[PDB]
Amino acid sequence: PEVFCFITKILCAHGGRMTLEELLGEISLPEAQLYELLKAAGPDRFVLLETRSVVATTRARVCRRKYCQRPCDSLHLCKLNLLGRCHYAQSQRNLCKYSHDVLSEQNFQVLKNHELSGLNQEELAVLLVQSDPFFMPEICKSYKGEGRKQICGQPQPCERLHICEHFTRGNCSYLNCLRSHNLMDRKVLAIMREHGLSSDVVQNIQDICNNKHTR
RNA sequence: CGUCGU
Ligand SMILES: [Zn+2]
Ligand SMILES: [Zn+2]
Ligand SMILES: [Zn+2]
Ligand SMILES: [Zn+2]
């Protein structure tokens, strides 16, 4: 029960993804023990890839509401502050309607349910930016397929993601979806990078979503 | 002027 957090912390320390070989070069287990532990926690915690790689993930999500009334089993926090980027950490302190206490008692309890309470703020941020689609740039609501040319402000090119929103939440079931499931697209990667997500992070998001899509 | 906003 405590071994899973141990692994996650190391994965989160190394960008959220490590090869199985490189993982073994950090721990005191033979490959047989490690590999059977990853399978146990399941793909909602560790996504396994083909050399072999492991991608860290979690079901834990940040509440999307501006103001939320309990009950709610999501984390409640300022994403910006978690990333250390909220400009209202010092000067106003108010005018940010979101919690700057990452490890609040309500949050600590959510973290417990997802077996993440041993994580520091940096690891938690690493895990969430690649697991919680709420940390992604806005997805274009008018986008309808790459065989169209819809009004995303033609004279001012769309600054939003043109991908399938259902895919990002692991819920695309459309037989022959027309919306892109390809996050590694050049223009997507640019918006992603502008938003603070490197191509390495997007690749992890891509692989987590792919795993969820191949249900 | 689309959520988290010098
Ligand atoms: Zn909530
Ligand atoms: Zn804030
Ligand atoms: Zn668009
Ligand atoms: Zn889709």
PDB file of C-alpha atoms (C1' of nucleotides) and ligand atoms in Angstrom:
ATOM      1  CA  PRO A   1       0.000   0.000   0.000  1.00  0.00           C
ATOM      2  CA  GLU A   2       2.974   2.301   0.622  1.00  0.00           C
ATOM      3  CA  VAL A   3       5.037   0.967  -2.286  1.00  0.00           C
ATOM      4  CA  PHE A   4       2.838   2.683  -4.913  1.00  0.00           C
ATOM      5  CA  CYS A   5       3.424   6.169  -3.512  1.00  0.00           C
ATOM      6  CA  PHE A   6       7.154   5.431  -3.409  1.00  0.00           C
ATOM      7  CA  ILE A   7       7.161   4.667  -7.147  1.00  0.00           C
ATOM      8  CA  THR A   8       4.920   7.634  -8.065  1.00  0.00           C
ATOM      9  CA  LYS A   9       7.218  10.087  -6.243  1.00  0.00           C
ATOM     10  CA  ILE A  10      10.190   8.841  -8.277  1.00  0.00           C
ATOM     11  CA  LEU A  11       8.248   8.921 -11.571  1.00  0.00           C
ATOM     12  CA  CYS A  12       6.983  12.413 -10.714  1.00  0.00           C
ATOM     13  CA  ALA A  13      10.555  13.436  -9.890  1.00  0.00           C
ATOM     14  CA  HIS A  14      11.645  12.348 -13.369  1.00  0.00           C
ATOM     15  CA  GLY A  15       9.051  14.174 -15.457  1.00  0.00           C
ATOM     16  CA  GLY A  16       6.209  11.703 -14.986  1.00  0.00           C
ATOM     17  CA  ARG A  17       7.718   9.003 -17.207  1.00  0.00           C
ATOM     18  CA  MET A  18      10.646   6.574 -16.915  1.00  0.00           C
ATOM     19  CA  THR A  19      11.787   3.509 -18.817  1.00  0.00           C
ATOM     20  CA  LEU A  20      11.451   0.326 -16.767  1.00  0.00           C
ATOM     21  CA  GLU A  21      15.227  -0.104 -16.954  1.00  0.00           C
ATOM     22  CA  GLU A  22      15.875   3.420 -15.644  1.00  0.00           C
ATOM     23  CA  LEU A  23      13.302   2.806 -12.899  1.00  0.00           C
ATOM     24  CA  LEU A  24      15.257  -0.263 -11.773  1.00  0.00           C
ATOM     25  CA  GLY A  25      18.373   1.925 -11.672  1.00  0.00           C
ATOM     26  CA  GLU A  26      16.781   3.917  -8.862  1.00  0.00           C
ATOM     27  CA  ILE A  27      15.381   1.128  -6.654  1.00  0.00           C
ATOM     28  CA  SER A  28      16.208  -2.112  -4.826  1.00  0.00           C
ATOM     29  CA  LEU A  29      13.839  -4.490  -6.576  1.00  0.00           C
ATOM     30  CA  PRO A  30      14.405  -7.041  -9.321  1.00  0.00           C
ATOM     31  CA  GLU A  31      12.536  -6.418 -12.580  1.00  0.00           C
ATOM     32  CA  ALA A  32      10.068  -9.209 -11.740  1.00  0.00           C
ATOM     33  CA  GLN A  33       8.888  -7.546  -8.499  1.00  0.00           C
ATOM     34  CA  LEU A  34       8.600  -4.039  -9.955  1.00  0.00           C
ATOM     35  CA  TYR A  35       6.755  -5.076 -13.109  1.00  0.00           C
ATOM     36  CA  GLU A  36       4.096  -7.052 -11.207  1.00  0.00           C
ATOM     37  CA  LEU A  37       3.438  -4.134  -8.842  1.00  0.00           C
ATOM     38  CA  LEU A  38       2.707  -1.718 -11.700  1.00  0.00           C
ATOM     39  CA  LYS A  39       0.116  -4.122 -13.129  1.00  0.00           C
ATOM     40  CA  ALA A  40      -1.554  -4.391  -9.707  1.00  0.00           C
ATOM     41  CA  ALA A  41      -2.297  -0.685  -9.193  1.00  0.00           C
ATOM     42  CA  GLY A  42      -3.607  -0.673 -12.761  1.00  0.00           C
ATOM     43  CA  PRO A  43      -3.456   1.727 -15.755  1.00  0.00           C
ATOM     44  CA  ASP A  44      -5.334   4.423 -13.811  1.00  0.00           C
ATOM     45  CA  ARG A  45      -2.136   4.793 -11.785  1.00  0.00           C
ATOM     46  CA  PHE A  46       0.598   3.421 -14.064  1.00  0.00           C
ATOM     47  CA  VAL A  47       0.303   3.369 -17.873  1.00  0.00           C
ATOM     48  CA  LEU A  48       2.583   0.687 -19.393  1.00  0.00           C
ATOM     49  CA  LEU A  49       4.177   1.232 -22.821  1.00  0.00           C
ATOM     50  CA  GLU A  50       6.096  -0.548 -25.591  1.00  0.00           C
ATOM     51  CA  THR A  51      11.952  -1.316 -24.572  1.00  0.00           C
ATOM     52  CA  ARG A  52       9.377  -0.608 -21.844  1.00  0.00           C
ATOM     53  CA  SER A  53       8.204   2.626 -20.225  1.00  0.00           C
ATOM     54  CA  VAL A  54       5.875   3.554 -17.369  1.00  0.00           C
ATOM     55  CA  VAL A  55       3.769   6.737 -17.226  1.00  0.00           C
ATOM     56  CA  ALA A  56       2.433   7.976 -13.873  1.00  0.00           C
ATOM     57  CA  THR A  57      -1.211   9.037 -13.639  1.00  0.00           C
ATOM     58  CA  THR A  58      -4.127   9.353 -11.184  1.00  0.00           C
ATOM     59  CA  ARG A  59      -7.931   9.576 -11.074  1.00  0.00           C
ATOM     60  CA  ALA A  60      -7.631  12.639  -8.833  1.00  0.00           C
ATOM     61  CA  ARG A  61      -9.016  15.779 -10.401  1.00  0.00           C
ATOM     62  CA  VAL A  62      -9.212  19.473  -9.607  1.00  0.00           C
ATOM     63  CA  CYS A  63     -12.738  20.869  -9.218  1.00  0.00           C
ATOM     64  CA  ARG A  64     -13.539  23.104 -12.219  1.00  0.00           C
ATOM     65  CA  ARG A  65     -16.078  25.289 -10.408  1.00  0.00           C
ATOM     66  CA  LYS A  66     -15.599  28.939  -9.497  1.00  0.00           C
ATOM     67  CA  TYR A  67     -17.495  28.299  -6.257  1.00  0.00           C
ATOM     68  CA  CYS A  68     -18.320  24.779  -5.132  1.00  0.00           C
ATOM     69  CA  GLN A  69     -20.680  23.584  -2.407  1.00  0.00           C
ATOM     70  CA  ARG A  70     -19.967  20.255  -0.697  1.00  0.00           C
ATOM     71  CA  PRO A  71     -20.232  17.375  -1.272  1.00  0.00           C
ATOM     72  CA  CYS A  72     -17.448  17.225  -3.859  1.00  0.00           C
ATOM     73  CA  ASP A  73     -14.690  14.630  -4.096  1.00  0.00           C
ATOM     74  CA  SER A  74     -12.325  16.723  -6.213  1.00  0.00           C
ATOM     75  CA  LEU A  75      -9.307  18.729  -5.143  1.00  0.00           C
ATOM     76  CA  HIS A  76     -10.013  22.408  -4.556  1.00  0.00           C
ATOM     77  CA  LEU A  77      -7.007  24.543  -5.319  1.00  0.00           C
ATOM     78  CA  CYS A  78      -5.553  27.319  -7.420  1.00  0.00           C
ATOM     79  CA  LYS A  79      -3.866  25.619 -10.377  1.00  0.00           C
ATOM     80  CA  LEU A  80      -1.726  28.729 -10.923  1.00  0.00           C
ATOM     81  CA  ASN A  81      -0.492  28.730  -7.324  1.00  0.00           C
ATOM     82  CA  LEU A  82       0.186  24.974  -7.463  1.00  0.00           C
ATOM     83  CA  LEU A  83       2.442  25.764 -10.410  1.00  0.00           C
ATOM     84  CA  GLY A  84       3.765  28.731  -8.427  1.00  0.00           C
ATOM     85  CA  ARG A  85       2.405  31.166 -10.978  1.00  0.00           C
ATOM     86  CA  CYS A  86      -0.460  32.969  -9.262  1.00  0.00           C
ATOM     87  CA  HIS A  87       0.156  36.714  -9.229  1.00  0.00           C
ATOM     88  CA  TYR A  88      -2.173  37.014  -6.228  1.00  0.00           C
ATOM     89  CA  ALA A  89       0.032  35.001  -3.877  1.00  0.00           C
ATOM     90  CA  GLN A  90       1.483  38.139  -2.299  1.00  0.00           C
ATOM     91  CA  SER A  91       0.093  41.475  -3.555  1.00  0.00           C
ATOM     92  CA  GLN A  92      -3.684  41.004  -3.357  1.00  0.00           C
ATOM     93  CA  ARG A  93      -4.009  37.599  -1.644  1.00  0.00           C
ATOM     94  CA  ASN A  94      -7.725  38.140  -2.166  1.00  0.00           C
ATOM     95  CA  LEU A  95      -8.986  38.471  -5.773  1.00  0.00           C
ATOM     96  CA  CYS A  96      -7.982  34.830  -6.217  1.00  0.00           C
ATOM     97  CA  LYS A  97     -11.149  32.924  -5.410  1.00  0.00           C
ATOM     98  CA  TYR A  98      -9.179  29.669  -5.320  1.00  0.00           C
ATOM     99  CA  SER A  99      -7.395  27.909  -2.448  1.00  0.00           C
ATOM    100  CA  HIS A 100      -3.670  28.545  -2.058  1.00  0.00           C
ATOM    101  CA  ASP A 101      -3.514  25.907   0.655  1.00  0.00           C
ATOM    102  CA  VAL A 102      -2.679  22.895  -1.525  1.00  0.00           C
ATOM    103  CA  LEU A 103      -2.623  20.481   1.404  1.00  0.00           C
ATOM    104  CA  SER A 104      -5.822  21.703   3.079  1.00  0.00           C
ATOM    105  CA  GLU A 105      -7.642  19.161   5.252  1.00  0.00           C
ATOM    106  CA  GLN A 106     -10.304  18.562   2.591  1.00  0.00           C
ATOM    107  CA  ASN A 107      -7.581  18.200  -0.037  1.00  0.00           C
ATOM    108  CA  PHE A 108      -5.478  15.904   2.154  1.00  0.00           C
ATOM    109  CA  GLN A 109      -8.520  13.639   2.433  1.00  0.00           C
ATOM    110  CA  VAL A 110      -8.986  13.515  -1.349  1.00  0.00           C
ATOM    111  CA  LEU A 111      -5.278  12.757  -1.693  1.00  0.00           C
ATOM    112  CA  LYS A 112      -5.716   9.907   0.807  1.00  0.00           C
ATOM    113  CA  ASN A 113      -8.552   8.323  -1.211  1.00  0.00           C
ATOM    114  CA  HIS A 114      -6.250   8.306  -4.243  1.00  0.00           C
ATOM    115  CA  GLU A 115      -3.208   7.238  -2.230  1.00  0.00           C
ATOM    116  CA  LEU A 116      -1.266  10.435  -3.023  1.00  0.00           C
ATOM    117  CA  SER A 117      -0.938  12.063   0.428  1.00  0.00           C
ATOM    118  CA  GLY A 118       2.818  11.368   0.575  1.00  0.00           C
ATOM    119  CA  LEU A 119       3.439  13.676  -2.404  1.00  0.00           C
ATOM    120  CA  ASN A 120       4.928  17.159  -2.065  1.00  0.00           C
ATOM    121  CA  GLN A 121       3.552  20.130  -4.020  1.00  0.00           C
ATOM    122  CA  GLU A 122       6.052  19.770  -6.878  1.00  0.00           C
ATOM    123  CA  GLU A 123       5.299  16.073  -7.441  1.00  0.00           C
ATOM    124  CA  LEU A 124       1.556  16.704  -7.159  1.00  0.00           C
ATOM    125  CA  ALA A 125       1.781  19.460  -9.784  1.00  0.00           C
ATOM    126  CA  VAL A 126       3.804  17.165 -12.068  1.00  0.00           C
ATOM    127  CA  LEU A 127       1.206  14.398 -11.732  1.00  0.00           C
ATOM    128  CA  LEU A 128      -1.789  16.682 -12.260  1.00  0.00           C
ATOM    129  CA  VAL A 129      -0.571  18.607 -15.340  1.00  0.00           C
ATOM    130  CA  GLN A 130      -0.376  15.306 -17.233  1.00  0.00           C
ATOM    131  CA  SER A 131      -3.418  13.584 -15.678  1.00  0.00           C
ATOM    132  CA  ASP A 132      -6.014  16.344 -15.221  1.00  0.00           C
ATOM    133  CA  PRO A 133      -7.283  17.807 -18.532  1.00  0.00           C
ATOM    134  CA  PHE A 134      -8.328  20.914 -16.579  1.00  0.00           C
ATOM    135  CA  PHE A 135      -4.642  21.937 -16.721  1.00  0.00           C
ATOM    136  CA  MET A 136      -4.716  21.900 -20.533  1.00  0.00           C
ATOM    137  CA  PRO A 137      -5.315  25.016 -22.641  1.00  0.00           C
ATOM    138  CA  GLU A 138      -8.921  25.663 -23.683  1.00  0.00           C
ATOM    139  CA  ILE A 139     -10.302  23.263 -26.298  1.00  0.00           C
ATOM    140  CA  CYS A 140     -12.112  24.936 -29.218  1.00  0.00           C
ATOM    141  CA  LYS A 141     -15.833  24.331 -28.809  1.00  0.00           C
ATOM    142  CA  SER A 142     -16.556  25.155 -32.483  1.00  0.00           C
ATOM    143  CA  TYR A 143     -14.027  22.639 -33.836  1.00  0.00           C
ATOM    144  CA  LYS A 144     -15.816  19.809 -35.652  1.00  0.00           C
ATOM    145  CA  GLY A 145     -13.286  17.894 -37.754  1.00  0.00           C
ATOM    146  CA  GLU A 146     -10.193  18.324 -39.918  1.00  0.00           C
ATOM    147  CA  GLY A 147     -12.307  18.078 -43.068  1.00  0.00           C
ATOM    148  CA  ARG A 148     -14.071  21.329 -42.214  1.00  0.00           C
ATOM    149  CA  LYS A 149     -13.106  25.013 -41.937  1.00  0.00           C
ATOM    150  CA  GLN A 150     -15.457  26.283 -39.205  1.00  0.00           C
ATOM    151  CA  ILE A 151     -15.657  29.885 -37.887  1.00  0.00           C
ATOM    152  CA  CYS A 152     -12.972  29.835 -35.183  1.00  0.00           C
ATOM    153  CA  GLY A 153     -12.384  33.438 -36.171  1.00  0.00           C
ATOM    154  CA  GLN A 154     -10.957  32.886 -39.677  1.00  0.00           C
ATOM    155  CA  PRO A 155      -9.247  36.301 -39.932  1.00  0.00           C
ATOM    156  CA  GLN A 156      -7.620  35.664 -36.528  1.00  0.00           C
ATOM    157  CA  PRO A 157      -6.393  32.010 -36.381  1.00  0.00           C
ATOM    158  CA  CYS A 158      -7.764  29.818 -33.621  1.00  0.00           C
ATOM    159  CA  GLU A 159      -5.722  30.026 -30.432  1.00  0.00           C
ATOM    160  CA  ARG A 160      -7.590  27.117 -28.858  1.00  0.00           C
ATOM    161  CA  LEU A 161      -6.891  23.394 -29.086  1.00  0.00           C
ATOM    162  CA  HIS A 162      -8.462  21.645 -32.070  1.00  0.00           C
ATOM    163  CA  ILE A 163      -8.739  18.171 -30.594  1.00  0.00           C
ATOM    164  CA  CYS A 164     -11.546  15.915 -29.397  1.00  0.00           C
ATOM    165  CA  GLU A 165     -12.565  17.035 -25.901  1.00  0.00           C
ATOM    166  CA  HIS A 166     -14.092  13.604 -25.198  1.00  0.00           C
ATOM    167  CA  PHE A 167     -10.696  12.017 -25.971  1.00  0.00           C
ATOM    168  CA  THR A 168      -8.924  14.225 -23.393  1.00  0.00           C
ATOM    169  CA  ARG A 169     -11.331  12.982 -20.715  1.00  0.00           C
ATOM    170  CA  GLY A 170     -11.011   9.374 -21.866  1.00  0.00           C
ATOM    171  CA  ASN A 171     -14.586   9.331 -23.145  1.00  0.00           C
ATOM    172  CA  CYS A 172     -14.478   9.337 -26.933  1.00  0.00           C
ATOM    173  CA  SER A 173     -16.713   6.541 -28.172  1.00  0.00           C
ATOM    174  CA  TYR A 174     -17.631   8.068 -31.528  1.00  0.00           C
ATOM    175  CA  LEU A 175     -17.257   5.477 -34.247  1.00  0.00           C
ATOM    176  CA  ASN A 176     -14.882   7.261 -36.613  1.00  0.00           C
ATOM    177  CA  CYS A 177     -14.518  10.536 -34.724  1.00  0.00           C
ATOM    178  CA  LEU A 178     -13.667  13.439 -37.025  1.00  0.00           C
ATOM    179  CA  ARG A 179     -11.942  15.481 -34.338  1.00  0.00           C
ATOM    180  CA  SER A 180      -8.193  14.994 -33.871  1.00  0.00           C
ATOM    181  CA  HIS A 181      -6.976  12.621 -31.159  1.00  0.00           C
ATOM    182  CA  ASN A 182      -3.422  13.687 -32.035  1.00  0.00           C
ATOM    183  CA  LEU A 183      -1.951  15.936 -29.331  1.00  0.00           C
ATOM    184  CA  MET A 184       1.509  15.727 -30.889  1.00  0.00           C
ATOM    185  CA  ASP A 185       0.331  17.971 -33.716  1.00  0.00           C
ATOM    186  CA  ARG A 186       2.629  20.924 -34.403  1.00  0.00           C
ATOM    187  CA  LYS A 187       0.017  23.637 -33.758  1.00  0.00           C
ATOM    188  CA  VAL A 188      -1.309  21.859 -30.645  1.00  0.00           C
ATOM    189  CA  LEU A 189       2.206  21.512 -29.235  1.00  0.00           C
ATOM    190  CA  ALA A 190       2.748  25.253 -29.742  1.00  0.00           C
ATOM    191  CA  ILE A 191      -0.392  26.216 -27.800  1.00  0.00           C
ATOM    192  CA  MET A 192       0.574  23.576 -25.220  1.00  0.00           C
ATOM    193  CA  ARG A 193       4.105  24.995 -24.877  1.00  0.00           C
ATOM    194  CA  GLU A 194       2.773  28.576 -24.698  1.00  0.00           C
ATOM    195  CA  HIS A 195       0.525  27.380 -21.877  1.00  0.00           C
ATOM    196  CA  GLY A 196       3.440  25.865 -19.983  1.00  0.00           C
ATOM    197  CA  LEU A 197       3.310  22.243 -21.143  1.00  0.00           C
ATOM    198  CA  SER A 198       6.454  20.881 -22.831  1.00  0.00           C
ATOM    199  CA  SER A 199       6.274  18.266 -25.601  1.00  0.00           C
ATOM    200  CA  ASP A 200       7.492  15.662 -23.089  1.00  0.00           C
ATOM    201  CA  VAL A 201       4.463  16.420 -20.906  1.00  0.00           C
ATOM    202  CA  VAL A 202       2.110  16.381 -23.909  1.00  0.00           C
ATOM    203  CA  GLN A 203       3.572  13.022 -24.946  1.00  0.00           C
ATOM    204  CA  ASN A 204       2.660  11.664 -21.512  1.00  0.00           C
ATOM    205  CA  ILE A 205      -0.848  13.138 -21.837  1.00  0.00           C
ATOM    206  CA  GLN A 206      -1.023  11.576 -25.310  1.00  0.00           C
ATOM    207  CA  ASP A 207      -0.084   8.124 -23.968  1.00  0.00           C
ATOM    208  CA  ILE A 208      -2.446   8.306 -20.975  1.00  0.00           C
ATOM    209  CA  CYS A 209      -5.332   9.341 -23.226  1.00  0.00           C
ATOM    210  CA  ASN A 210      -4.451   6.643 -25.779  1.00  0.00           C
ATOM    211  CA  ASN A 211      -4.553   4.013 -23.021  1.00  0.00           C
ATOM    212  CA  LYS A 212      -7.950   5.248 -21.852  1.00  0.00           C
ATOM    213  CA  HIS A 213      -9.196   5.345 -25.467  1.00  0.00           C
ATOM    214  CA  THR A 214      -8.215   1.735 -26.085  1.00  0.00           C
ATOM    215  CA  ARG A 215     -10.542   0.890 -23.192  1.00  0.00           C
TER     216      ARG A 215
ATOM    217  C1'   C B   1     -14.871  38.956 -23.998  1.00  0.00           C
ATOM    218  C1'   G B   2     -13.960  30.852 -22.658  1.00  0.00           C
ATOM    219  C1'   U B   3     -13.086  28.782 -16.463  1.00  0.00           C
ATOM    220  C1'   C B   4      -7.076  30.150 -13.088  1.00  0.00           C
ATOM    221  C1'   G B   5      -7.598  37.030 -13.855  1.00  0.00           C
ATOM    222  C1'   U B   6       0.368  41.382 -13.162  1.00  0.00           C
TER     223        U B   6
HETATM  224 ZN    ZN C   1     -15.842  21.048  -5.903  1.00  0.00          ZN
HETATM  225 ZN    ZN C   2      -4.363  31.840  -6.953  1.00  0.00          ZN
HETATM  226 ZN    ZN C   3     -11.026  26.728 -33.083  1.00  0.00          ZN
HETATM  227 ZN    ZN C   4     -12.837  11.823 -30.521  1.00  0.00          ZN
END
